[PDB]
Design an enzyme around this catalytic site. Structure first.
Site, mmCIF file in Angstrom:
data_model
loop_
_atom_site.group_PDB
_atom_site.id
_atom_site.type_symbol
_atom_site.label_atom_id
_atom_site.label_comp_id
_atom_site.label_asym_id
_atom_site.label_seq_id
_atom_site.Cartn_x
_atom_site.Cartn_y
_atom_site.Cartn_z
ATOM 1 N N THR A 284 0.846 -1.098 0.071
ATOM 2 C CA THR A 284 0.079 0.051 0.173
ATOM 3 C C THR A 284 0.775 1.180 -0.105
ATOM 4 O O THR A 284 1.799 1.356 0.938
ATOM 5 C CB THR A 284 -0.831 0.050 1.151
ATOM 6 O OG1 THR A 284 -1.935 -1.073 1.029
ATOM 7 C CG2 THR A 284 -1.599 1.257 1.333
ATOM 8 N N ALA B 211 -7.080 -3.959 5.824
ATOM 9 C CA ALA B 211 -8.318 -3.294 4.857
ATOM 10 C C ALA B 211 -9.538 -3.137 5.528
ATOM 11 O O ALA B 211 -10.342 -2.299 5.485
ATOM 12 C CB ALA B 211 -8.368 -4.568 3.762
#
Ligand SMILES: *[C@@H](O)[C@H](CC(C)C)NC(=O)[C@H](CC(C)C)NC(=O)[C@H](CC(C)C)NC(=O)OCc1ccccc1
Ligand SMILES: [Mg+2]
Ligand SMILES: [Mg+2]
EC number: 3.4.25.1
Lengths: 195, 233, 231, 244, 222, 240, 235, 212
Positions: H1, H49
């Site tokens: 990410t 997430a």
């Protein structure tokens, strides 16, 4: 190591606090103010675990501001320090303790005297002419043991503080990105914008 | 969280054309000690269901009491308790399966593996498994512990899929179960020769057989085995 | 008189006035009819409106695929009791993989209503219910009263002017019980039964409310143009 | 059920008064008179014991004047038992403050806390209020010498001179007449005793029917001393002022 | 020490078409190196034209499906028999999963159906509730074997048009239900060959405007 | 716990306990609030039945809730402390979470919400208090003046009075206060507030308290002599 | 004295019936539902001219697709509104959609009978809940402290309710436009109000599918009042 | 990410990647790491997430409730602090979140807050968060100026994500761009790295470490 220093001179208390906020491998910010004004003549700097530091400082700030409104009166630095100590002493035996160390610099308007209190996360309070938390004290205490007087001026206190910061910048391994300096005296709290 | 102390080994079962068969030995082991030699691990519920239990015996006795109490409670204000509103295998299983999964979710499981064998109201065969984790599954053959590894292979040679069930008679199925129990006595170090067997047929009802023994065992070939390799004498 | 201040107080003749006053709220409510054969069970309910601009208050509530009821009295109390039934029907399915028996559903309602009649502080339920359902022993019709009394019946009616429909069903008993494998004719008998309780007003398209459950028929409610067939 | 027997202690009258508070004040009006007078160099607390006996052990007795801490004291008017409940709560509150801030509690803060407790009994809980009126005499470094009073309603007010209990109307008129702002403790002592001597329902005012106390800066240098007077000391001050 | 989790193996696969959607899963159930059942259904019709599968630890999977079916039931009771849309179902399932964030349902959940415009929809979840709408998703034991094949044969990844040499991509032409079932069957046949926990049988649930249809196919039993 | 329903409806649709709480407000000393163009003034009556009082330490009628908002009241004095304390706590709590001081409307809505809660909670009676809440929103120069009452209803006022003989001073304000042109200065606003109290007060000595609140946390209480000058000027103009 | 949850001999809850009397003393609120939208209007009724009327908030937003008007002890409505707003937002969080107007109304009405010896008494306020959803379109509900709610094509609550309801009986038809409904609310409010109707002592609002819930400006309402006067003088 | 956000002359640029991993396994290349809280508020997602998704959609519900009660929009400061105060309650329980709450209001102007599952809440002009933050910082820091054009700033943010997607194994997929002004946020498209990399290499003449 989140450098926070404090020095009490003739007529004022001077607090210096590092600007860096390092999360892991990156310096996320280089202009962070690690302090909160508790009352017009009382300032608290802080250092410890992420999140806890600000949460604790703002919690204390809110409580002192509440007291000020209720009584229409400013608590003495000694009184504020005792309140803070008790909160930390309560905290250390909690489910999840506040992992926060603080310096409380204040000017007592009744006694016309500056006062500096050093309190660690266990709730260990001491009144001092000069103080520090973390690894800063390992360099600065002995340096101040040599260069301090009780009758020093605010300007002499700042020069003495520059000497401490220079030593820290020379011998400490992290780049703490300089310090924000604040002075507490009879006229209140002000920030030294050039340091 | 605990550890099982007094334990019961394999429970084996299979479907056949008109019903289900289930069996389990009569032993309560205390580690390597074959402590208790008269333990009944098949527990009938009504005349249409048999619950076979392996694992911790103290937890088995608890479950035994829950089922006994279930029968009592179902009869309350129920004029059709011995007829239309009698307990079904599917009801009894789902109850246990609910309890087992609840207990594992509290981190305090009933240290057991259970097989509910029975016949439903419409004559359909019922055979389903549940264990300490709340895991459930159904199959033409079901077995716990060592039976899963040794009995299932033998019983699946008789009923390999669903279409083989109507082709399988009660004599053939019972023969397979009894053979499997002998194999387990040969190879499971926590098994006993003595066992109980239950048949639930849609026509002839519940037949509960006690005090069975493993028989027709092959040991004679042992005499010819000498040493571990080079030893002639 | 002096013994109607709360539900915890018997009268000198052994009566519970607060329960009797709760029973009175049902009589003020709009009429609803329940009847059954061996294959199906039907609820017919006359819905009531506040005025011409308002909607017609719903009378029938679904509890499960195989069970539901019609109400007469305090509607919020029917919502509480129907919610309880929904939960009990649901507990039976999730835990025991078993559809809740209609008779046992009645027993649970009785016991819930009873606790409110013996304790200080609370109050009795102010509603009467007609529960229909199809379970493992066929079709069923129950009548619930907030005193706690639950009764299994072939047919019945509760609410205002319910005595007329109840008499009709008492005459027709032998006929409508035999209506097996014919839902439309069983509803016709229910619509004709509720018609005996009507005065001045008649059954219109947004006035009538019908519900049915049976052998291969889930509990379904009919409103609007779906009941025009039976007018 | 139980509703039948509930007096409903926390309700308004049609006129907007709290029944129980009003009736508690009526109770207090029959209690022994207590007077507080504040001077520039100290505070006086004087109070009359109610119809005593010759066989009452006076030197070990205490029904009127109580010590809350080294700086603050109270004079009681009403039910003594009710007062001791509140006094012990006030003593604890003062110690809590001292532990927290490491400073003696300001007089008003202690008074407000006790007054808030009384208020609670008039608004919620369904319990009867405390049938007690206090005169608080105290000192702190903010406002100096202070006199307060609180009553069962939980309302409190500050005073230069004040009386509670019996004959307050007559007592307040006499105080209002002879009180002056530049007054001293020795003069205030005389005023307090003279006021009691006139308002008393007894035939004569004697040492055995009185409790007396002073809060003086008359302590060696900048500090405050509490003096709860002994029976012999009350007898001497009665002769000195010329009452006996 | 007691281990509250287990691994029942299995593999599932959801593909979304233009006006349909499929949710497939093998029928094998296992522990360690043993087979529990050769036919234990894993994909379920949950009502309102929604199909669902929760693959991994079967006890947790059954519990979740059971709770969601219950959620659909109470959605009808509480909201006047309103149809639960696939997007609303997905959000509901997130809260079911995240509600056990600190003692998770140890499953890979996938639902399939039609969106409110009638187009095919597939939604994919992690064990603690993070979800995302996708055109294609495999889950479970052999998911690592199947997903790359689906990237290639469903979304035409790394595929280009001959003659242009890497300049022009293969156009994303839609797939019919017959073409999708072929990819599903080949996906499971391939997964059965190379993964020991996959086999026995394949059960596919196809969702259209007309309803929910089933198709069953045999798989190797070794 | 004590759960008794004290506030309940009567056959004519009235909650008598709430209405009797208003009678306690009617008994309380008069309080008045007037907002000018760039200020708000809170006037309060002090009954002169109580002399020999120590005015240094006696609880003042106007209370600061925060540095930018004030609260005065009419009714039971003990009850008012509870509302003031709660309000002060909520003010600091708002600063802590929203990082912005309360709006005057928000603080009013909170206090009003507390008052309402005590009208349908078991075992408690309503507050016998009506409040006037005044101040300036953060970074805003528009004056704010709100009123609350025991029932829990609140609303904004150009000018308003509460307490004993409030009917008379409201009569005065309704004819003397012009909306199109409010008191432009601090002097004009204070003068109108003192005038309105002089209709009711008796003597203009230590019976009138005035507190002026200006934008940006500028709050000050007028002294006896400062108020006495207004009292002198008003009556000298009246002698004509 | 007597129980709070006591039944009368007629089979009604005393406290509920008494709260209905408090609602009759309240200021008038009118709602009209059309195929183009739902209109909500209220009488403000300021007790004094010094009271700034724009602070009187008797029409309130619950969500973008649901609005609400009140009548009676308006302080009691604040917790009901807070619950309604929470219920509307919470449902969107759980289901990624708007909540049905009926379901929202049902949630509010569940609070009504939660009183005993929970809150100490019923609510002393009635609500007109108006909104739109995809399933049942434009809707208007009347939520009482009895826990009962009726759907209405048009409804008036408050002091002038029975007089206004009779007027709504004649005037309402299924082909009303939004503009026609706005004027109709103003017409009936003007009829039952004590003081003369203007933009300062009366407030309009509406809910449409496109724009959602909107409280009308005093300038916008003033024009509709002027448009009303002219059309009444036209015959 | 890899996520970033920076303040400049024309408001705020927000840029994120699209990859989601489970160990070395690439689970998704098409995930939305920007959440449109309201027409003027954006939230970024890094770390867990589920944690990020769940609590930032929850945040949007709390922000909506604020503007219903207060008839005024929520400040970026207040919105960020709701989230930071929430995660502080859960501190020690194991939440994993690295977020930026980006937005604009009249009284604040364009504002960015870094909010952390450790409880850290920081106001600032530039932030890069996630396993690829260091790579984005390298490009962003060396080319950042306060006076970039909305066009140059958008590209810098996009280019900084590309840099990180390349070098960081756990970042990649595609680039989602946003631009926040006085009048709210504006989406600036999904940019697949598989095409963007080669385009940037050719046009910019960078990425000589690669065989192309
Ligand atoms: C990058 O930070 C990215 C941002 C998300 C918003 C996608 N996060 C991840 O890729 C993250 C790995 C991080 C922590 C290094 N992956 C996950 O959160 C992952 C996403 C799914 C969709 C693959 N989920 C995950 O690993 O599950 C948690 C779990 C695992 C096993 C049992 C219970 C819970
Ligand atoms: Mg220390
Ligand atoms: Mg295989």
């Amino acid at each position: 190591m989140d450098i926070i220093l404090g020095i009490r001179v003739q007529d004022s208390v001077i607090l210096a606090s590092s600007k860096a906020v390092t999360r892991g491998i990156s310096v996320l910010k280089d202009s962070d103010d690690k302090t909160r004004q508790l009352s017009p003549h009382t300032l608290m700097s802080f250092a410890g675990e992420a999140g806890d530091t600000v949460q604790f400082a703002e919690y204390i700030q809110a409580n002192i501001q509440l007291y000020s409104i209720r009584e229409d009166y400013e608590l003495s630095p000694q009184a504020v320090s005792s309140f803070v100590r008790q909160e930390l002493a309560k905290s250390i035996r909690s489910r999840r303790p506040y992992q926060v160390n603080v310096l409380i610099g204040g000017y007592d308007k009744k006694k016309n005297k500056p006062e500096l209190y050093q309190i660690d996360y266990l709730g260990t309070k001491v009144e001092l002419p000069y103080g520090a938390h973390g690894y800063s004290g390992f360099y600065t205490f002995s340096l101040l043991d040599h260069h301090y007087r009780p009758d020093m001026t605010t300007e002499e206190g700042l020069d003495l503080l520059k000497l401490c910061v220079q030593e820290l910048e020379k011998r400490m391994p992290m780049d703490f990105k300089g310090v924000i300096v604040k002075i507490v005296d009879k006229d209140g709290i002000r920030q030294v914008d050039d340091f | 969280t605990q550890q099982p102390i007094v334990t019961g080994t394999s429970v084996i079962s299979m479907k056949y054309d008109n019903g289900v068969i289930i069996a389990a030995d009569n032993l309560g082991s205390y580690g390597s000690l074959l402590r208790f030699n008269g333990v009944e691990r098949l527990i009938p519920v009504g005349d249409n269901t048999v619950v076979g239990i392996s694992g911790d015996i103290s937890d088995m006795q608890h479950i035994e009491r829950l089922l006994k109490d279930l029968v009592t409670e179902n009869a309350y204000d129920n004029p059709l308790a011995d007829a239309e509103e009698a307990l079904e295998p599917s009801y009894i299983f789902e109850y246990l399966a609910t309890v087992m999964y609840q207990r594992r979710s509290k981190m305090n499981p009933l240290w057991n593996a259970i097989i509910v064998a029975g016949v439903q109201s419409n004559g359909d065969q019922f055979l389903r498994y549940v264990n300490l984790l709340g895991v459930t599954y159904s199959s033409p053959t079901l077995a716990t512990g060592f039976g899963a590894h040794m009995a299932n292979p033998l019983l699946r040679k008789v009923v390999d899929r669903e279409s083989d069930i109507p082709k399988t008679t009660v004599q053939v199925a019972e023969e397979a179960i009894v053979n499997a129990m002998r194999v387990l006595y040969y190879r499971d170090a926590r098994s006993s020769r003595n066992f109980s067997l239950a048949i639930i047929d849609k026509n002839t009802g519940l037949t509960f057989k006690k005090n069975l023994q493993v028989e027709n065992m092959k040991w004679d070939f042992a005499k010819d085995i000498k040493g571990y390799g080079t030893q002639k004498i | 008189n002096n013994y109607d201040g709360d539900t915890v107080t018997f009268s000198p003749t052994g009566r519970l006035f607060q329960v009797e006053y709760a029973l009175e709220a049902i009589k003020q409510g709009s009429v609803t009819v329940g009847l059954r054969s061996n294959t199906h069970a039907v609820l017919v309910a006359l819905k009531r409106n506040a005025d011409e601009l308002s909607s017609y208050q719903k009378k029938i509530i679904k509890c499960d695929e195989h069970m539901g009821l019609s109400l007469a009295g305090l509607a919020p109390d029917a919502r509480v009791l129907s919610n309880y039934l929904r939960q009990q029907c649901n507990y039976s399915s999730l835990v025991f993989n078993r559809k809740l028996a209609v008779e046992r559903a009645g027993h649970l309602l009785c016991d819930k209503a009873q606790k409110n009649t013996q304790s200080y502080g609370g109050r009795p339920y102010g509603v009467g219910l007609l529960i229909i359902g199809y379970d493992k022993s066929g079709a069923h019709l129950l009548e619930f009263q907030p005193s706690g009394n639950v009764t299994e019946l072939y047919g019945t009616a509760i609410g205002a002017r319910s005595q007329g429909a109840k008499t009709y069903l008492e005459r027709t008993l032998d006929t409508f019980i035999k209506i097996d494998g014919n839902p439309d004719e069983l509803i016709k008998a229910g619509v004709e039964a509720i018609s005996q309780s009507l005065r001045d007003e008649s059954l219109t398209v947004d006035n009538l409310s019908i519900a049915i459950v049976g052998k291969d028929t889930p509990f379904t409610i009919y409103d609007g143009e779906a009941v025009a067939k039976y007018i | 059920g139980s509703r039948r027997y509930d007096s409903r202690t926390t309700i308004f009258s049609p006129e907007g008064r709290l029944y129980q508070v009003e009736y508690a004040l009526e109770s207090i009006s029959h209690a022994g008179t207590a007077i507080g007078i504040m001077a520039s160099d100290g505070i006086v607390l004087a109070a009359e014991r109610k119809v005593t006996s010759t066989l009452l052990e006076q030197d070990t007795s205490t029904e009127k004047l109580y010590k809350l801490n080294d700086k603050i004291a109270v004079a009681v008017a009403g039910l003594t038992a009710d007062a001791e409940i509140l006094i012990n709560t006030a003593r604890i509150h003062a110690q809590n403050y001292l532990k927290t801030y490491n400073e003696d509690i300001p007089v008003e803060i202690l008074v407000r806390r006790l007054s808030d407790i009384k208020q609670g009994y008039t608004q919620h809980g369904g319990l009867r209020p405390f049938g007690v009126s206090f005169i608080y005499a105290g000192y702190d470094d903010r406002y100096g010498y202070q006199l307060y009073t609180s009553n069962p309603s939980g309302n409190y007010t500050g005073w230069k001179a004040i009386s509670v209990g019996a004959n307050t109307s007559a007592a307040q008129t006499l105080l209002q007449m002879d009180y002056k702002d530049d007054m001293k403790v020795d003069d205030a002592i005389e005023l307090a005793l003279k006021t009691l001597s006139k308002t008393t329902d007894s035939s004569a005012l004697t040492y055995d029917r009185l409790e007396f106390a002073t809060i003086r800066k008359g302590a060696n240098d900048g500090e405050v001393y509490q003096k709860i007077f002994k029976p012999q000391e009350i007898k001497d001050i009665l002769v000195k002022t010329g009452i006996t | 020490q007691f281990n509250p989790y287990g691994d029942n193996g299995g593999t599932i696969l959801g593909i979304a078409g233009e006006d349909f959607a499929v949710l497939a899963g093998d029928t094998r159930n296992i522990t360690d190196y043993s087979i529990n059942s050769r036919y234990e259904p894993k994909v379920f019709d949950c009502g309102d034209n929604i199909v669902m599968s929760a693959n991994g630890f079967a006890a947790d999977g059954d519990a979740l499906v059971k709770r969601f079916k219950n959620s659909v039931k109470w959605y009808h009771f509480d909201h006047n028999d309103k149809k639960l849309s696939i997007n609303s179902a997905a959000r509901n399932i997130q809260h079911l999963l995240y509600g056990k964030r600190f003692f998770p349902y140890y499953v890979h959940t996938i639902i399939a159906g039609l969106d409110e415009d009638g187009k095919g929809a597939v939604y994919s979840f992690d064990p603690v509730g993070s979800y995302e709408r996708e055109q294609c998703r495999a889950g479970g034991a052999a998911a690592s074997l199947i997903m790359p094949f689906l990237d290639n044969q469903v979304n035409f990844k790394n595929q280009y048009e001959p003659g242009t040499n890497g300049k022009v991509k293969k156009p994303l032409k839609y797939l019919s239900v017959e073409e999708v079932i072929k990819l599903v069957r080949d996906s499971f046949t391939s997964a059965t060959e190379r993964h020991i926990q996959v086999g026995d049988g394949l059960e596919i649930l196809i969702v259209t405007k007309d309803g929910v249809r089933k198709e069953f196919y045999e798989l190797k039993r070794d | 716990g004590y759960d008794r329903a004290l506030s309940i409806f009567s056959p004519d649709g009235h909650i008598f306990q709430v209405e009797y709480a208003l009678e306690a407000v009617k008994r309380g000393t008069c309080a008045v609030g007037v907002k000018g163009k760039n200020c708000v003034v809170l006037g309060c009556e002090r009954r002169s039945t109580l002399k020999l009082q120590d005015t240094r330490i006696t609880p003042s009628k106007v209370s600061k809730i925060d540095s930018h908002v004030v609260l005065s009241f009419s009714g039971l004095n003990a009850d008012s402390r509870i509302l003031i304390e709660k309000a002060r706590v909520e003010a600091q709590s708002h600063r802590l979470t929203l990082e912005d001081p309360v709006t005057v409307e928000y603080l009013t809505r909170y206090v009003a919400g507390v008052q309402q809660r005590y009208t349908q909670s078991g075992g408690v009676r309503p507050f016998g208090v009506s409040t006037l809440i005044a101040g300036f929103d953060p970074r805003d120069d528009e004056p704010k003046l709100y009123q609350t009452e025991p029932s829990g209803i609140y609303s904004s006022w150009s000018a308003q009075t509460i307490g004993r003989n409030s009917k008379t001073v409201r009569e005065f304000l309704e004819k003397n206060y012009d909306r199109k042109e409010p008191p432009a200065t601090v002097e004009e606003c204070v003068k109108l507030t003192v005038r309105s109290l002089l209709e009711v007060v008796q003597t203009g000595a230590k019976n009138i308290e005035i507190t002026v609140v200006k934008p940006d946390s500028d709050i000050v209480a007028l002294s006896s002599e400062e108020i006495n000058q207004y009292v002198t000027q008003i009556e000298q103009e009246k002698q004509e | 004295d007597r129980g709070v949850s006591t039944f009368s001999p007629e089979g009604r809850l005393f406290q509920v019936e008494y709260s209905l009397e408090a609602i009759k003393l309240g200021s008038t609120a009118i709602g009209i539902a059309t195929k183009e939208g739902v209109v909500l209007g209220v009488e403000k009724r300021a007790t004094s001219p010094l009271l700034e009327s724009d602070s009187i908030e008797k029409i309130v937003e619950i969500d973008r697709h649901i609005g609400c008007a009140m009548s009676g002890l308006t302080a009691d409505a604040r917790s009901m509104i807070e619950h309604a707003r929470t219920a509307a937002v919470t449902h969107n969080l759980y289901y990624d959609e708007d909540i049905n107007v009926e379901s929202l109304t049902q949630s509010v009405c569940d609070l009504a009978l939660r009183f005993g010896e929970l809150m100490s008494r019923p609510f002393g306020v009635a609500l007109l809940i108006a909104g739109h959803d995809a399933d049942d379109g434009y809707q208007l509900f009347h939520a009482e402290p009895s826990g009962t709610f009726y759907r209405y094509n048009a409804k008036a609550i408050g002091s002038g309710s029975e007089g206004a309801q009779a007027e709504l009986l004649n005037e309402w038809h299924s082909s009303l436009t939004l503009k026609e409904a706005e004027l109709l609310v103003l017409k009936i409010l003007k009829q039952v109000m004590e003081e003369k109707l203007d933009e300062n002592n009366a407030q309009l609002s509406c809910i449409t599918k496109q724009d959602g819930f909107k409280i009308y400006d005093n300038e916008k309402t003033a024009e509709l009042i002027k448009e009303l006067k002219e059309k009444e003088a036209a015959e | 990410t890899t996520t970033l956000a920076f303040r400049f002359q024309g408001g705020i640029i927000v840029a994120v990647d699209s990859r989601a991993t489970a160990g070395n396994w690439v689970a998704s290349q098409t995930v939305k790491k920007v959440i449109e809280i309201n027409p003027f508020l954006l939230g970024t997602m890094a770390g867990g997430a589920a944690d990020c998704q769940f609590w930032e959609t929850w945040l949007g519900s709390q922000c909506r409730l604020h503007e219903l009660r207060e008839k005024e929009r929520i400040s970026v400061a207040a919105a960020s602090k709701i989230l930071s105060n929430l995660v502080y309650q859960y501190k020690g329980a194991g939440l994993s979140m690295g977020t930026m709450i980006c937005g604009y209001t009249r009284k604040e102007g364009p504002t960015i807050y870094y909010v952390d599952s450790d409880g850290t809440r920081l106001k600032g002009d530039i932030f890069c968060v996630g396993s690829g933050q260091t790579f984005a910082y390298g490009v962003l820091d060396s080319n950042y100026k306060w006076d970039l054009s909305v066009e140059d700033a958008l590209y810098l943010g996009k280019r900084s994500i590309l840099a990180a997607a390349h070098r960081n194994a756990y970042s990649g997929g595609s680039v989602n761009l946003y631009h926040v002004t006085e009048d709210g946020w504006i989406y600036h498209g999904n940019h697949d790295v598989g095409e963007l990399f080669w385009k940037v290499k050719e046009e910019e003449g960078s990425f000589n470490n690669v065989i192309g």
